[PDB]
Structures are given as C-alpha cells and as structure tokens.
Amino acid sequence: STAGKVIKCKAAVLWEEKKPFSIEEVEVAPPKAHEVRIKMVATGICRSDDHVVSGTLVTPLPVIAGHEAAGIVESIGEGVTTVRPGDKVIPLWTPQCGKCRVCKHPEGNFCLKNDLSMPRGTMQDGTSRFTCRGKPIHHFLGTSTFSQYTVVDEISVAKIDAASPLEKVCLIGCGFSTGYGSAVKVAKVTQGSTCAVFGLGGAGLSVIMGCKAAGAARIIGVDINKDKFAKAKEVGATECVNPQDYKKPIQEVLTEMSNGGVDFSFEVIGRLDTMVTALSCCQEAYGVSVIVGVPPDSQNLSMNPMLLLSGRTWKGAIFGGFKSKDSVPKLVADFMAKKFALDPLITHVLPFEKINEGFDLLRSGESIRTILTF
Amino acid sequence: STAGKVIKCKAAVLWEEKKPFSIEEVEVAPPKAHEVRIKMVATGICRSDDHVVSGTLVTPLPVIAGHEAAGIVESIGEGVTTVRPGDKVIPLWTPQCGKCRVCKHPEGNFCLKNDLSMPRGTMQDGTSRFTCRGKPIHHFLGTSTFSQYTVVDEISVAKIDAASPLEKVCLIGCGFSTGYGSAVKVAKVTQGSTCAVFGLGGAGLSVIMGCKAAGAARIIGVDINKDKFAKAKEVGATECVNPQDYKKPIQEVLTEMSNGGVDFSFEVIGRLDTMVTALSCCQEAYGVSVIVGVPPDSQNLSMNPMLLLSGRTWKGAIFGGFKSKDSVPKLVADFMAKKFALDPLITHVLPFEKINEGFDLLRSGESIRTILTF
Ligand SMILES: NC(=O)c1ccc[n+]([C@@H]2O[C@H](COP(=O)([O-])OP(=O)(O)OC[C@H]3O[C@@H](n4cnc5c(N)ncnc54)[C@H](O)[C@@H]3O)[C@@H](O)[C@H]2O)c1
Ligand SMILES: NC(=O)c1ccc[n+]([C@@H]2O[C@H](COP(=O)([O-])OP(=O)(O)OC[C@H]3O[C@@H](n4cnc5c(N)ncnc54)[C@H](O)[C@@H]3O)[C@@H](O)[C@H]2O)c1
Ligand SMILES: [Zn+2]
Ligand SMILES: [Zn+2]
Ligand SMILES: [Zn+2]
Ligand SMILES: [Zn+2]
C-alpha cells in the first residue's frame, strides 16, 4: 500500500527556462488534510505550459508544470469529502473554493484561491509536496500534472464519470473548456452571428467549436500558419485568412468581409497586437471581443479608447468562464453523451517519457494537442 | 414670414480654437428635403462643447458648436413626416437613420450617419446652412444648437411632449441621458451592487442617478474637486473620495474600500489615466467598467491585458447607449411623469448672450450645468 507514505516516481521537472524538461525521480509526500494524491493517467501539452518554459508565463522555478490532465485518486487526506480513492478525476488549475466573493458570484469563475495572478508555486498552505535531488520543487497552478503522481488541494480536483476515457477527457481540463466556454459562456455568441477567431490551435479550434454550437452563421479563422486552416474548417470555420497574404491590416480586411465588423472576435494567440486587432475588427457600436490568449509577462498593450467609446465591449476570461468544479463533470458528462467532440484536437499521442518531443511538435506548429500517457 | 426664406440671427461662432465664442449675426438657409429648421429655446453647456474649444475634440472650424438643446420647429423641408412647425423638439447629436446595421441592431445606437467618428461638420448632404460675414460655417455633430435658429436633418431630431419645460428637458439631449443610460442601459447596474463614478459633473451625477435608480447599494464618487461632493451625495453617492487626499493610487483605495473591487466603475472625466484606473478598481473576475468620457484627440492609453484576462468587462458608450430618436421622447415623458429629476444638474441659468460666462463657470469648477436661454 502507498496510502500515507511518500511515493517516489518520475516527473518532468523544469530546472531553468528555455531548457528541456528533465524526466527524473521525485518524492511525492502523502496528502495532508483536504488534499488529494492523484495517479496521473493522461496529460495534454497546452501552449501555457510552454509559456512557462519560455518565461512568457512567469511562475517560480524549478517547477513541475502541467495543468490539463486526468487521473485516478490514489489516496485522500483527512476531511476530504468530494473524492475517494479509485475515482477518475480532473485537476482544476482554476479552483472553486465555493467560499470566496468570486465563487459566490453567479458569473465569476476566477477563484481568489488561484495561483495564476500572483504565482507562489505551492499548495494552498504555502508548502510543496515535491522533492527532487533533495531539493523542494515548485507546483504549477496547484496541479503539476507532469508527474506520475501529484497532490492537489480538494478545491482543485473534480470527480468525473467513472467510465470516462481519460486520454480524451483530459482536454476538458483546459484547452477544450476554455475555448468552448469563451464562445458560449463569455462572449455568448448568437445565432446568425459572424465570428472571427485569431489563433487556430487547441484553444482556438475549441472557440470555433463553441461558435458553431452557438449557431454562428460565419466563423472566420485567422492564423499565420495556413496549415491550421484545414482543421479549422473541419470544426466549423466557414473561411480562413492569413494576415501575411494581405497588403493591408487584417482588422481592415475583416471589417470589409463582415461588411462593417464582426459580431464576436476572439484573441486566442497571446500577443498584444492581435488583442488590439481583434478588438478593432468587431463592430464599433455593438461588437464584442474576448481575450483568451496569455500575454507576455508584465507587458502593456497600447490602444485608442475611442474603440470602446463607440460602443464595443472588451473582456477576457480564465478557463472559459466556467466555475471549474461544477462544470468539469457536467462537461465530461456531455462528452460521454456525444454533445461535443475532442478527437479533432488530438493530433499526437506520446508516452510521458517523450514529453520533450511533444513540446517540439507544438513549437514546430505541427500539432494542436499531443496527449501524454503515463 | 421666415418660412422658405433665409433667416438672419445671432449665433455663437467659434472662429479659432482656444478663443471665446463670437456672438454675431449669421444667415440660416431654409431647410431642404428632409431637413428641419428649429428655433432654439434653451441649450445646456456640456463639457464636450468646451473640448472643441480646447482642441480635445477635433471638428472642422469655424463652427457653431452646441448639441444639448431643445427648441420649436419653425419650418420643415419637403418630405419631413416626423415633426411639424410649432413642435417642441430636441436635436440628436447621435442620429437614428433607422436603416443602417447599427440602428437595425437591437443594442446598437451609435448610428452610422453620425458625425463624431470622422467629423465633417456638414449636413448629411455635405454642405452647410450657416453663413457669417460671407463665410461658410461648420455644423457640429449635425446639431449646432448655439444659434437662435438651426437646421438639422430629420434623422437628427425628435418630437417631444408639447407640455415640456424646454429649459429643463434640454439636458435630455446629452448629459442626463448619457450618464443615466450608461448606468442602467450600458453597464446595467444591479440591485445591491457597489459602484464607483470618476468625475462628478453633469454626466457623472447622472451616472449616480442611474446607479441609484438601478438599486446600487454603494455609490462611491471620485473627484479631485471636493466642492463636487455635496451634490453627488444629494443625488445618491454614499461616499466621495478625493484622489489627492491619498498617498497611494486610488484604484488601491477603492479596492480596499470595496473589499476586493467594485461591481461597476464609470469613467466620466475624459482622461487616459482615470480610464485605466477605473477599469483596475472594479473586481478582477466579474467587474464591469464603462468609459463615458471623451478622451483627448489621437491619444492611446497603456494597459496590462491581464486586467481583462482575469474576467473584467470594459465597455464604452455614446449617448448612454440610447437609440436617440426612440428614447429621447420616452425620457421626456418619464421626466414629465416625475420618474427622475433634472433640477440637481442645473446650477446656473443665463441668457444665450452670456454663453462665454457659462463656459467660464464650467471651466472654473463652479457650475455643473448652465442652461442658456435664447
Ligand atoms: N485564458 C485561459 O484560460 C487560457 C487557456 C488556454 C490557453 N490560453 C492561451 O491561448 C493561447 C493559445 O493556446 P493554444 O494552446 O490554442 O495555442 P497554439 O500555439 O496551439 O495556438 C496559437 C496559434 O496562433 C497562431 N499565431 C501565432 N501568431 C499569430 C499571429 N501573429 N497571427 C495569427 N495567428 C497567429 C499560431 O500559428 C497558432 O496556430 C496561448 O497564449 C495560451 O496560453 C489561455
Ligand atoms: N459618451 C458620451 O456620449 C458623452 C456624453 C456627454 C459627455 N461626455 C464626456 O464625459 C466627460 C465629462 O463631462 P461632464 O459634462 O460631466 O463635464 P464636467 O467637467 O462638468 O465633469 C468632469 C468632472 O471630472 C473631474 N475631474 C477632472 N480630473 C479629475 C481627475 N483627475 N480625477 C478625478 N476627477 C476629475 C472634474 O472636477 C469634474 O467634476 C467629458 O469628457 C465629456 O466630454 C461623453
Ligand atoms: Zn492551458
Ligand atoms: Zn473561490
Ligand atoms: Zn442608422
Ligand atoms: Zn455632451
């Protein structure tokens, strides 16, 4: 039995930025009260994990990254009431403590117990459960899924369907739910509308999936990598444009295509310039632009306030506006019910050990989602 | 009489930027097809009229500014069906052609026939109806109310209650409807919410009126001129704070005051810094910030997109989001039904002749609204 004892296993540790992960042994302390130790089954490679490697998303190093995954509860600590050993679960990188101001608000989902705004790289109690080479290692967004085992606080774990295919539903841990929720929940795309989606990767395809579900008459995919267009069309994009093909700025191009601006635009890249462009391309009087992309650490964008004064609405969101713990199981349920598909997002599958190759696949632009199996 | 003939009358002409208005005689051509010549009865001095003088709001000079007003139709042109001579009317600086995508949109109001985005300073047909000393003078937002008589396009005029007190209802032409709608229509202030209003002048006090009407439990007024606090509280503010009384940034103070950020914030000054501050002080996960102020010409603001990514909604709005020709008559009716008050905004009432004195009362910080009677 491992319940109550330290577990040695392998994890992909990031020691320095812009360096390959180090698959080596780590010691995982047993779960304290209201914490859960999960045996990871599958984890997806989201761009945000690479953001950590690149310094785009700053969080304390050395760290065990990963935040989009699914596994099986190994053991629970004292007082845990929502999961039991043997349960299939999805780690919530955006917690749902249910007690804070945001959690009790009918709309807000960015729990104040989150570790995304001011990254500490610890458990809710300010400590770590990871030791490598005798050195304490940092957690990432309280999940740290790039490990055969991880310990998370109770508020950062959701029990899902016992019959859920973990190699697929892991995407509901981030990529899918983010893009999908951004369209249907945050921007609230309407029937007959024209949408523009900047960035046709895992999250952007999910946004297209969200707009299609919402009944958008037009969904224009925007990406500088034309190789991304086929997949986009496949999931709902009615047309795709590459900014590099035009002699004029894309927001102008898009404004002409939509005869005056789109109803809903989405920034799913993570650049300051595309954020402004996405805003500029939605109709000046009633257009809505939603930021999904993670910006470079601490950098400020420059924009003219008249873009807003005319009537535009600009907002951003975390995890697609989904109250994590309530939503994740409902989303897995719907997937089981064939309400939406995850297959189109999965382009590569690799064993955990091949984690480094997976990030090269992302970086080459060859992939959308590579799922890592433990 | 005057009908179908050229009328000679007094108007306040701004020949150059940063100059007092020149009260002289001008010639008002008769209305053309679908135009209306209106005899002005009362016009409110709005801060935007001063923006023109200061160059903050660029529009072709020389010109007859003025947009917040009420008058009586003197004669209508061939094809006018909405108003008739003797009708009490209110000119609309944001028209409602009723045929463009925006007017047809359930939530759009910034009509595509507007002259604010790219000021021409002409009638819808590209020409002027004003002549002064043999020289053609520009129109302002298609209204030009600083004249005893003016000619506006039918789409820029609304018929109002015949028993309307024109010297009060003229505020419905701008300041009041703007602030009121911003709060109840655009921001959509919820019952029991905490609001923060930056700028306590005529538009700001109206934002407060709307917030209170919307049920806001807490309404914090913010202004660097403490003299503005008495009236703000009179109209609804629960507390007022002067930024310069604090050693630390006001968004900090407001965040501490609202225990994490306010629900709704409003920028009603016209500064890039207070626009970012306003957004920053509303709760990060579900706060809504509305820009009401007109920023200085051609300047960009700088902000960190994380403010939005966390969940904040940032909007802006022209004329309080009200479809002009539809709402103005409705608002007047409600005023007549004692649904809201206009007297709190009226601090000075001067003759048209004293136009410059009123601008001086505004500039000095002494007035909220000065109504000029012709
Ligand atoms: N808010 C959240 O909760 C949240 C969640 C998931 C992902 N994200 C962020 O969204 C972004 C994308 O995630 P992904 O996994 O879908 O990424 P990805 O790398 O798979 O996709 C980014 C895409 O944008 C394209 N692109 C790059 N520069 C472009 C440009 N200048 N113009 C047009 N297209 C351009 C790339 O070719 C690529 O197809 C990342 O920044 C990620 O951190 C945010
Ligand atoms: N969007 C629209 O349709 C619309 C309509 C009407 C007015 N406006 C704009 O709203 C703004 C305000 O108009 P108003 O008529 O109420 O004018 P106003 O000048 O009477 O009110 C401005 C107030 O803000 C205060 N202020 C200035 N700097 C400040 C600072 N740094 N911090 C805090 N407070 C400060 C002033 O003391 C004053 O009370 C202007 O830019 C005006 O052009 C926009
Ligand atoms: Zn992610
Ligand atoms: Zn919470
Ligand atoms: Zn119109
Ligand atoms: Zn005004």
Cβ of B309 within 8 Å of Cβ of A294? The answer is yes
d(CA A102, CA A232): 34
Pocket test for ligand 1, best of A109, A198, A294 (most atoms within 8 A of CB): A294
Catalogue the active-site residues of A: 46, 48, 51, 67, 174
Question: How far, in Å, is the centroid of ligand 5 from the Cα of B305?
Answer: 32
Rounded Cα gap, residues B177 and B154, in angstroms: 20
Instruction: Indicate if the alpha-carbon torsion angle A255, A261, A264, A270 is positive or negative.
Output: positive
A271 in contact with ligand 1, CB cutoff 6 A? yes
Rounded CA separation B348/B335 (Å)? 20
Question: Ligand 2 in contact with B203 (CB < 6 A)?
Answer: yes
Instruction: Kindly report whether the peptide bond that precedes residue A243 is cis, defined as omega within 30 degrees of 0.
Output: no
| Alpha-helical segments (H) within chain B | 47-54, 101-104, 166-169, 175-181, 202-213, 229-235, 250-257, 272-281, 306-309, 324-336, 355-364
What one-character DSSP code corresponds to residue B51? H
Pull the structure tokens for residue B355.
Answer: 């136009």
- On whether the CB atoms of residues B144 and B123 are closer than 8 A, the answer is no
The amino acid that residue A308 corresponds to is L
Check residue A162 and report its DSSP letter: T
The DSSP call for residue B300 is: P
Q: Which ligand 1 atom is at minimum distance from the Cα of A206?
A: 16
CB contact under 8 A, B315 and A316: no
What are the Cα distances from residue A111, in Å, to A191, A283, B314?
A: 31, 32, 20
User: Which structural technique was applied?
Assistant: X-ray
| B105 close contact with A: CB closer than 8 A | yes
Task: Annotate B330-374 with DSSP letters as a single string.
Answer: HHHHHHHTTSS--GGGEEEEEEGGGHHHHHHHHHHT--SEEEEE-
Cα B319 from Cα B93, distance rounded (Å) = 9
One-letter identity of residue B358: G
Q: Please name the member of A117, A272, A305 whose beta carbon is closest to the beta carbon of B310.
A: A117
Question: Is residue A70 within 8 Å of residue A89, measured between CB atoms?
Answer: yes
CB–CB of B311 and A260 under 8 A? Answer: no
Q: Is A191 exposed, middle or buried (0-12, 13-18, 19+ CB in 10 A)?
A: exposed
Please say whether the dihedral angle defined by the alpha carbons of residues B178, B184, B189 and B192, taken in this order, is positive or negative: positive
Is the Cβ of B317 closer than 8 Å to some Cβ of chain A? yes
The CA A154 to ligand 2 mean position distance, Å, reads 48
Could you give phi then psi for residue B7, rounded to 5 degrees? Answer: -105, 140
Helix-then-strand count for chain A, H and E: 11, 19
Beta-bridge mates of residue A36: A76, A152
Q: Do A301 and B302 touch (CB under 8 A)?
A: yes
Q: Is the CB of B224 under 6 A from ligand 2?
A: yes
Tell if the CB–CB gap between B316 and A304 is shorter than 8 Å.
no
Residues in A 273-292 with any Cβ partner in B closer than 8 A: 275, 283-286, 291
* Residue A175 tokens, joined: 């990529």
Pinpoint the residues of chain B covered by CATH 3.90.180.10: 1-178+318-374
The three state secondary structure string of A233-293 is HHHCCCEEECHHHCCCCHHHHHHHHCCCCECEEEECCCCHHHHHHHHHHECCCCCEEEECC
In sequence order, what are the beta bridge partners of A264?
A: A195, A288
B191–A contact, CB cutoff 8 A: no
What are the distances in angstroms from CA B141 to CA A36, B115, B157, B324? Answer: 64, 5, 12, 13
> CB of A224 closer than 6 A to ligand 1?
yes
Structural tokens at position B293: 């102020």
Peptide bond into B60 cis (omega under 30): no
What is the rounded distance in angstroms from the CA atom of residue B196 to the CA atom of residue B184? 14
Rounded CA-CA distance A175/A293 in Å is: 11
The total of other beta-carbon atoms located within 10 Å of residue B326's CB is: 14
Residues with C-beta atoms within 5 A of ion ligand 5: B 97, 100, 103, 111
Q: Which residues of B does the annotation mark as catalytic?
A: 46, 48, 51, 67, 174
Q: By CB neighbour count within 10 A (0-12 exposed, 13-18 middle, 19+ buried), where does B104 fall?
A: exposed
Q: Is B244 in the pocket of ligand 2 (CB under 6 A)?
A: no
CA distance B191 to chain A (A): 13
Q: Is the CB of B293 under 6 A from ligand 2?
A: yes
Q: Which helix (H) or strand (E) holds A374?
A: none
Phi, psi of A269 (to 5 degrees): -115, -65
**Contacts A289 to B, Cβ<8 Å:** none
Of B299, B304, B318, the CB nearest to A300: B304
Per-residue CA distances from A58 to A52, B72, B112 (Å): 6, 64, 44
The residues pairing with A10 across neighbouring beta strands, listed in sequence order, are A25
Residue where the block lists tokens 């920023």: B295
Q: Give the H/E segment covering residue B295.
A: none
SS3 content of chain A, % helix, strand, coil (to 5): 30, 25, 45
Strand, coil or helix: A84: coil
A313 at B interface, C-beta within 8 A: yes
Nearest to A288 by CA among A190, A214, A205: A190
Q: Which of helix, strand or coil describes residue B262? A: strand
Cβ-Cβ contacts under 8 Å, B103 against chain A: none
Residues whose CB is less than 8 angstroms from the CB of residue A292 and which lie 6 or more positions away in sequence, other chains included = A178, A179, A182, A199, A203, A204, A207, A266, A267, A268, A316, A317, A320
For A345, the enclosing helix (H) or strand (E) is none
CA distances from A213 to A76, A181, A189, A196 (A): 38, 11, 9, 15
Helix (H) / strand (E) containing A204: helix A202-213
In DSSP terms, which residues pair with A69 in a beta bridge? Answer: A43
Q: Which of B306, B307, B319 to mutate to test the interface with A (most CBs of A within 10 A)?
A: B306
Candidates 3.40.50.720, 3.90.550.10, 2.120.10.30, 2.40.50.140; CATH matching B179-317: 3.40.50.720
- A198 and A269 in contact (C-beta within 8 Å)? yes
CA–CA dist B13, B268 (Å, integer): 27
Domain B1-178+318-374, classified CATH 3.30.565.10, yes or no: no
Residue A151, judged by CB atoms within 10 A of its CB (0-12, 13-18, 19+), counts as buried
Structure-token match 């909007």, residue found: B315
Neighbours of A256 (CB within 10 A): 11
Alpha carbon A316 to its chain centroid, in Å, reads: 14
Q: What does the alpha-carbon distance between residue B261 and residue B240 come to, in Å, rounded to a whole number?
A: 16
Q: Is the CB of B319 under 6 A from ligand 2?
A: yes
- DSSP symbols for B87-104: -EEEE-SS---S-SHHHH
d(CA B121, CA B60): 6
Query: Are the C-beta atoms of residues A241 and A220 closer than 8 Å to each other?
Result: yes
Overall resolution, Å: 2.0
CATH 3.40.50.720 in chain A: give the residue spans: 179-317
Helix (H, G, I), strand (E, B) or coil at B316: strand
A–B: how many Cβ contacts below 8 A? 132
